[PDB]
Amino acid sequence: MGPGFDFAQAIMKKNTVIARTEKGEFTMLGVYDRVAVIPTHASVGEIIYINDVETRVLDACALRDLTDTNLEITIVKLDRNQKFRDIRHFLPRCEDDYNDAVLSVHTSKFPNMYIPVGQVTNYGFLNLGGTPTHRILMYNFPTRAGQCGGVVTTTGKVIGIHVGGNGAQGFAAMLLHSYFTD
Numbered sequence: 001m002g003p004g005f006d007f008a009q010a011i012m013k014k015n016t017v018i019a020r021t022e023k024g025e026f027t028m029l030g031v032y033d034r035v036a037v038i039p040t041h042a043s044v045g046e047i048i049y050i051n052d053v054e055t056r057v058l059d060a061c062a063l064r065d066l067t068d069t070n071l072e073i074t075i076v077k078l079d080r081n082q083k084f085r086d087i088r089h090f091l092p093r094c095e096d097d098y099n100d101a102v103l104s105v106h107t108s109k110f111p112n113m114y115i116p117v118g119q120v121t122n123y124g125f126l127n128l129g130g131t132p133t134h135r136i137l138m139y140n141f142p143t144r145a146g147q148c149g150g151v152v153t154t155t156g157k158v159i160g161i162h163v164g165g166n167g168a169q170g171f172a173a174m175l176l177h178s179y180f181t182d
């Protein structure tokens with residue numbers, strides 16, 4: 001509808017796949033080469049479905065900060081025959097607050113879904129499903145089940161992936177450039 005939705009659509013149309021695990025269907029962001037991210041609660045194993053194709057997982061790493069606290073981001077390397085557009089230059093370098101973000105989701109249940117979530121707070125600590133979690137972004141939108149893995153963008157930046165909500169607020173795990181150095 002406007003330039004925020006423009007940037008979000010550009011990311012969805014080239015840098016997402018539908019990931020299925022035994023814990024459900026997730027929006028999955030591809031970052032570069034065969035490397036993607038998904039919420040750690042997706043419980044990625046040795047095999048995953050990518051757009052309904054059986055795919056070997058070459059590596060999966062559940063990130064934690066240097067205090068050994070959950071970040072809720074798993075970095076997955078897929079045995080896929082095709083690379084993702086490199087979007088690492090759209091990742092923030094530092095923890096920050098943002099204005100006027102969009103949450104985008106693409107699953108079988110919620111295809112081509114875009115949500116203007118508004119102002120994003122560097123919330124920090126969250127007890128997420130009973131798990132102490134750091135680097136949490138918060139937005140004041142009543143998100144629901146089906147949206148986990150959804151991409152949080154501003155114009156020109158890919159800032160997080162949706163990992164939970166409390167019925168009134170939604171929560172994303174930050175993406176930082178430093179997670180994807182090679």
Ligand SMILES: c1cn2cnnc2cn1
Pocket residue numbers: 142143144145146147148163164165166167170
């Ligand atoms: C339950 C589950 N959720 C996932 N994302 N937001 C929510 C809210 N309530």
